[PDB]
């Protein structure tokens, strides 16, 4: 099962992949246009820990992590590429056509780990 990570995911929420990502129950799929922004926004500290917390994981042997409006349905292109996937960003509950997209669940990262 694959999880895929907002930018604002992993800028407000590192813990909660950190964790999923070293659940070994899901893939971690980060997207190009995410990895992408955050090379951007590394400004945000919490980009530059994003990406160097990625890199850790990398190092240590990870195999269950990758990289691979706007932003979200941009998930969507990347999702239907590998389309049990599953994205998660930030704004839980609260556009309507993004999460329309039928094939893919869209959850909020606290929303998913709290179930999980």
Do not use: M
């Not at 590394?42 to 994003?50: I, L, M, S, T, V």
């Not at 996937?85 to 606290?110: C, F």
């Amino acid at each position: 099962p694959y999880l895929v990570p907002d930018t604002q995911a992993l800028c407000h929420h590192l813990p909660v992949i950190r964790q999923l990502a070293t659940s070994g129950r899901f893939i971690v799929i980060i997207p190009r246009t995410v990895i992408d922004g955050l090379d951007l926004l590394k400004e945000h500290p919490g980009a530059r820990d994003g990406i160097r917390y990625l890199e850790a994981e990398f190092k240590k042997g990870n195999r269950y992590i990758r990289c691979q409006l706007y932003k979200i349905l941009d998930s969507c292109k990347q999702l239907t590429l590998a389309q049990l996937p599953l994205d998660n960003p930030s704004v839980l509950s609260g556009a309507l056509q993004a999460a329309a997209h039928a094939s893919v669940d869209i959850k909020n990262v606290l929303d998913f780990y709290k179930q999980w």
